[PDB]
Design a protein around this ligand. Sequence first.
Ligand SMILES: [Mg+2]
Ligand SMILES: [Mg+2]
Ligand SMILES: [Mg+2]
Ligand SMILES: [Mg+2]
Length: 1341
Amino acid sequence: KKYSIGLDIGTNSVGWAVITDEYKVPSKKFKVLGNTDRHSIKKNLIGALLFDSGETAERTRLKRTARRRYTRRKNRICYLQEIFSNEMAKVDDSFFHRLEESFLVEEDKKHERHPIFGNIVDEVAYHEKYPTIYHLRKKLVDSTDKADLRLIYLALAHMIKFRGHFLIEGDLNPDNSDVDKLFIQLVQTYNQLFEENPINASGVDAKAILSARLSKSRRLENLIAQLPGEKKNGLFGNLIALSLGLTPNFKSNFDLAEDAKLQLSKDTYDDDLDNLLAQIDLFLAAKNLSDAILLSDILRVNTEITKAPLSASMIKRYDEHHQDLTLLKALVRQQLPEKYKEIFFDQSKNGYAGYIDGGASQEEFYKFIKPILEKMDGTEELLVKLNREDLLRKQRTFDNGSIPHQIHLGELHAILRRQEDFYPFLKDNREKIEKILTFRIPYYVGPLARGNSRFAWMTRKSEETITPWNFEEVVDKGASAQSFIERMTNFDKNLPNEKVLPKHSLLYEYFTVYNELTKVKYVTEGMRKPAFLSGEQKKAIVDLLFKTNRKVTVKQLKEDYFKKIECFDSVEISGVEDRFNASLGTYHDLLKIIKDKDFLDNEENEDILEDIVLTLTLFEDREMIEERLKTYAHLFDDKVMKQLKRRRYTGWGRLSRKLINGIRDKQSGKTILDFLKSDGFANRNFMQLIHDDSLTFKEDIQKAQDSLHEHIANLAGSPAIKKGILQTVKVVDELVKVMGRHKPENIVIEMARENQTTQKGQKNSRERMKRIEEGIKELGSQILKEHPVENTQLQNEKLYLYYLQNGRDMYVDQELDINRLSDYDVDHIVPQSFLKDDSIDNKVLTRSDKNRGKSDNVPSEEVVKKMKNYWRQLLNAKLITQRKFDNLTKAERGGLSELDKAGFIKRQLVETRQITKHVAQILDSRMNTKYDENDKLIREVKVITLKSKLVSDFRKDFQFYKVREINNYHHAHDAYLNAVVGTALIKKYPKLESEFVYGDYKVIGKATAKYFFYSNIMNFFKTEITLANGEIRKRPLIETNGETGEIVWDKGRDFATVRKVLSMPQVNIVKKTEVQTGGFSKESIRPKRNSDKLIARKKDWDPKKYGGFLWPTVAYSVLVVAKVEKGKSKKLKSVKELLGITIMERSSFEKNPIDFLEAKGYKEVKKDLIIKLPKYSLFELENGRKRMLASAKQLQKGNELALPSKYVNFLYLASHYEKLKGSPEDNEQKQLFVEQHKHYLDEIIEQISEFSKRVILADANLDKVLSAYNKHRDKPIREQAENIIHLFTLTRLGAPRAFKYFDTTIDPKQYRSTKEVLDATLIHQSITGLYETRIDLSQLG
RNA sequence: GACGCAUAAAGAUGAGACGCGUUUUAGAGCUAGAAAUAGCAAGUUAAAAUAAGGCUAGUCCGUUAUCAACUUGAAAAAGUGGCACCGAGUCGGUGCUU
DNA sequence: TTGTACTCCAGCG
DNA sequence: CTGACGCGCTGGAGTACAA
DNA sequence: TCTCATCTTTATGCGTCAG
Ligand SMILES: [Mg+2]
Ligand SMILES: [Mg+2]
Ligand SMILES: [Mg+2]
Ligand SMILES: [Mg+2]
C-alpha cells in the first residue's frame, strides 16, 4: 500500500528508489512486449537513469555572433562593390566577377585565372612592384599620381574588410598628431601662456620615456633630470596629468584658471575644460600629446614623414624579415650545411619552412630555432631580435588586435584625398565610404530583423531597408535602447504584471532603510525592556544621520543622537550589527550634484526625481540621456545638468513602485512605506504588512497572481537545468504510474545545501578590500597610497585583478596602467578549450599581445622561470592561492595532460543546486493539487529536502561506504539511503516535520547552533555515542516515536534489510537514448584528396579538388533491410546493416526516407522495417552480454558489474589508509580488518576476470592485467588497492578508456564492429527501465 | 524553507566588434637532366568561404533545450503494462486473479 | 576486396 | 512559549596487415 | 580577446513570514 520515493539528482544522473514503511524495496513481475518469447520479467524498484549533461547556449551564441559578423562583413564588401561598380565597368568590366571567382580552380573558372589584371605579365609586375598590400597602401597614401582604379578598390577593400577595433572613442588623427616632435611647440605654448618666459632647454621627447616603459615613475624623474625643475606638480607640459590621468577626481595642482577635478583625456576629461570653457593652449596640446603617446605605444616608429604609419611599420617588418632571412641563410650555409634541408625545406620540423608553409606559430619557430643561433657564431643581432620577439615577423599576426580603427580611417581618408581629383565619383561619395568603414551597430539596438528573429527587439520608424547611411533616420534608437533593458529585467514577484525599481532609486533606498530601521529596539536604565523606535524618533535619526553620512555605524548613533538628542548616558541597541546594512547613497550623490537639500527633501518633486533616476539607470549614451533629461531644464541650471548626467547607475531591485508606495490600505489609507515610517507601536516591517490579515495588502497580492513542457519553458536561466528537471519529473510520475496511480506519503530529495559554522561562514564571506589590504600590507607596497579605492569599485573584475597583482603584469615584469584597462587582457590560466574554470584562481590580468601569444596552452616554461619569484612573492602574501600557483606553474609538471582534464567542475555543483531547488518546487506544486476553503494546501505528498552531510555521515558511520569507480549503482544506493533517512527522520520527530518538509517552517552563533543541532539529530541511529568529554552513552536498541509507541528503527532487522539491498545485484541502470544534435563535423578543414569521405564545403565545391570537412557526427542509426547491387556481374544481394544518418542528412532522410536510401545505393527497401536507433541504444546478446550503440560503426559496454558489498567496503577501507581522521581505535580496527582480509584482493581480481571473460571479451588485456598483478602482488596494500580501484575502468559501463596499473598502461579495446548486434535482441527501456519492449532482430530479414 | 538588505564565492542569458587560424586559387621558379630525381633560388601577401544551406528575402535565421516502444492525433497532446510469498549474479521460483 | 588492429586527430584568443 | 535530550569522461581517420 | 547590460544558486550577518 503506502510507499515512499527517494531521489538523488545529479547533472548527468538521477537516482530513484521505492521503499515501503518496512524499508524494503518492492519487486514486481513487469509485463514486457515485443516479438520475443519472454512475457514477464522480475524487476526491483530501485535504479538510476544516466544521461549526457545539458550543454549551455554559450557556444551557440558565439557561433551565431560569428555568423552575423561574417554576414555584415560580406555586406560591407557588397556596398563597396556597389559604389564602385559603374566606374569599374569602364576600365575592366569583369574585375569583381574574377574577384568573387578567385577560389575556383582554373578549369572551373569562366574568366582568366589571374584575378586582378587578367593577364600574367601585369600580375607579375604588380607583385614585383607591390610584394604586399602595405606597399600598395603606402604608395596610394603618399604618392600624388593617378593610379589604376583596381588597385584603389583593392586598397580600400583590404581596409574595410580588416578594419580594427573600436575601443577608442576619440578622433585620434594620424596625419599630424603621430609625430613626437610636438614637445617643442608644447613648450612654446607653455612660454606664451605662463607669463614668466622660461628657458626652453628641450631635451629628448617621449621616446626616452618609451625606451624603458610608459609610466609616471620613469617619465617624471626623466623630465625632471633633463630640464631643471621649477614646479613638481605644475611643470605644465608632458605631464602624467596630460598622458595617464590620476586615479581619483582630484583637483588641479597649481591651477591657471580654476581648481577642477582631473582625469585621463579619453572620455571623462571633456567636462574638465570648465576652467576655461565655463569661464569664457596647454590642454589642446595635452590632447595632442596623449594622442601621440597612444600612437607611439601602438606603432613603433616612422623615420621619414608619411600619412600612413601603419603601412610603414609593416614595410619595416617586411624589410627586416628579408634581411634576417638572407643573413640566416648565409650563416646556416657557412656553419651548419646539414641543417639547411631541415629548416628551409622540411615543413614539419617547425623550421622556417614549417613557419611559413607548415602550421608552426611564431613562438614555436622561436623555440625551435633559438638553440641554432646560440650554437653558431655571428647571431648576436638575431638573438636580441628573437628576445624582443621581433625576428622574422609576419604582417598578418596575432598581436594586430591592438591597432584601432582610426588608423585605417585616417589612411582611407588620405587615399580618398589623393585620388579625389582624378576620379570625381570618389569625391562625390567620400563620406559614404568613410561611413562604410566607421559604422557599427550599437549593442542596445541588436539585430536588424523584421519580426522573424527571437533575439531581436528593435523598432523602426519606417519600413525602408537599413543601410549605414540611413540608419539614424530609420531605426528608432530610443525605444530600441529602452527595450534592450526592459526585455531583460525581471518582473516583481508579488506583482507579476509590472516592472521593478532601479537599485539606486530614492524610493527603493527609502524603503530599504525604513524596513531595516523599523525593527531597531533600544534600551537603557530608564525603562525595563527594550522598545521599538517611534516614527518621530525614526524621522529624527534619518534626518540627523542618514542624510549626513554615506555609511553610518551604531557607534555614531549612540554618541551623536542618543547622547545629544533625547539625552541618555548609555543606550544598548538591538536589531542591528555594528554597521547598518542600508544607506541613502543616492541622496548623498544628488546632494553633492544638485547642492539643494530642500529640493530633495520636498514631497511634491519626488516623481521627477524618480523618472530622473529611471532615465539615468536605463540609458548611458550621452545624447540619449540629454534627450530624455531635457524636460527638467526649467528646474535645473545648465551647469548642474552638465554635472548630473554623468551620474551613471546600474542595477535594479526586486520590488515595484505600486507595491511599496502605490497601493493603499482601504481602512488606514497608508502605503507600505507610510506604515514603515510610522505604524504606532506595532512597528511592522515589510513581511508583516504582506502577511498580516488585518491590512488589505494581502488579498490584493493574491488577486495580483497547463502541461509540463510549457511549465518548463517559462522558467528563466540556463537551458541545461531543464534537462535534469524534465528527467527527474518523468522519473517521478513514471514511478507513480508503476504503483497503480497511488501517490506516496513523502518524496525525499537530496538537496545540495550545507550547514557550516558562523565563524567559518563569516571568514569565507568577508569583503575583498580586507584581502587586498592585508596582502599589500604583507608585501609592503604603496599602491593603495597612489591609487585610493573603496570596496565597491572592486566589484569590477579588471580593477580587482589589477589590485590582486599589485599593479604589475605577472607574465612579464612591467608596471601596468590603471586607466588603460581597456587594452589589457584578462585570460584563463587553464584555457577554455581544455577545462571550464572561471574561478579567481584561474584568472590573470595581462597584456594583450602576451595573452594572444599564449594561446590554447598553459603559459610556457620560459615565463615560469622568468616570473616564478614574483609568483611566490604573491603566494606567501596571501594574494594568490596554492591552486593559482599550481595552475600557474603547470608547465613545469608536464603542462596539459589527461589527468588535468579529469575531475569535477563547480558548474556541475551550481547546476545541481539550481536543478534540485526547481525539482522541489515543481514536485510540490504537482503532487499537492487539492485545497479547501480553510486550509490553503493539503499535504498529500510531503516533499522532504535532506542535506548531503546527513547521508554522508550515515554512510561513514555504519560502514556503508561508496566509491564511484566500480559501478553506477551508487546513485540508486544514495537514493535509497535518502529515502530511508528521510522517512526515519520524519517518523522519529513529527514536530521537526516543519524543518524538513518544503513550504513549512518552525516559528554562540545562530549558524553554529543550527550546525550542532543538525549534527546531534543523527545520533538516534547509533547504538553507542561518544560525547565530547570522551565518555560513552547508550540508547535503546529498538527506537520508538516517543510520543507514540509506534516503532521507528530496529537496529537489528532494519540494518540487516539495509545491508541486504546494498548487496542487491539487480539495479535498473538506464542510459538515455538520445538523437545527437549540434555541429555535424569537426571544424578543421582538410586539404584536397582523392578519398570519398571528405564532406563538401559547398554545393559546387567538389572536395576532390577543394578539400572539405571530416569526422561527421551521426544523428542516429537506421536499420535497413534491402538488396545491394554487388559484383561485376551484378546480382541483388539481400543484406541487413546499420547506416548512419548525419546531421545535415537528418532533414533530407526525414523528408523522404525511401529516396534517401535509394540514393545511397540500396534498393527494394522494406519501408516498415526501418528502425530508428539513436545513440546508446541497448542490445542484448548471448550469456547476458549487453552492448550500447555509440554510433553506426562503434559499440559501447553495456553490462554493469554487481560487486558484493563486502568487497566494496574492503576496497574503500584499504585505500585512504591514514586519512580517515576518526579515533585511533577505529583506525586500528580497520587496520586489522584489512590485514586479516588481504585475501579479498585475489577474490576481487577473480570476480573481475570472470566478469570480463563473460561480457567484456578483451582477452589480451585480461592476460596483461593478470600478469601485471602477479608481478606486483608483493606491494603494500595502499598502492595495490588504489590500482584495483583504477582497474574497474575496464569493466565500467560506457566507452572503453585507457587506464593504468602500477607501471603498465593498458590501451582500450575498441568495439569497432556493429555486425553482431544485427541478430541481437533490441531493448526499448522506459524512463525508469521497468517497462521493456524486447525486439528480436534475428527474426527480421 | 521562503522573503528584504549587506558581504561573498561559483555560474548563466543577450547584443555589438576585433585579431588570427584553415582551405582553393593568384604571386611565370632556374639549371643538369632518358630519371626515379639532384643542386640552386624563393618564402612575409591578396581574394573567396568559414557550419551544407532556408524562405516570411531580413545587413534575418540555421550547433541550447525537446526525443524509450506501441495506439489515437496534422501537430500540440492523450492513453497502454495484476497481486502476495520464498529466494538471489544482473533476476529466478511458487500460489490466487480476470 | 573485406575485416581487423594500432596510432593519430580534434578552431582559438 | 513552542521543537530534542548529556555533481564527469571519444568517435572517426589513416596506415598497415589477416583472409 | 574586448565593450555593454541583465539575472541564478549557494554561504554567513541582521529582521520577518504562526499559532
Ligand atoms: Mg547527492
Ligand atoms: Mg589566455
Ligand atoms: Mg550518486
Ligand atoms: Mg541535444
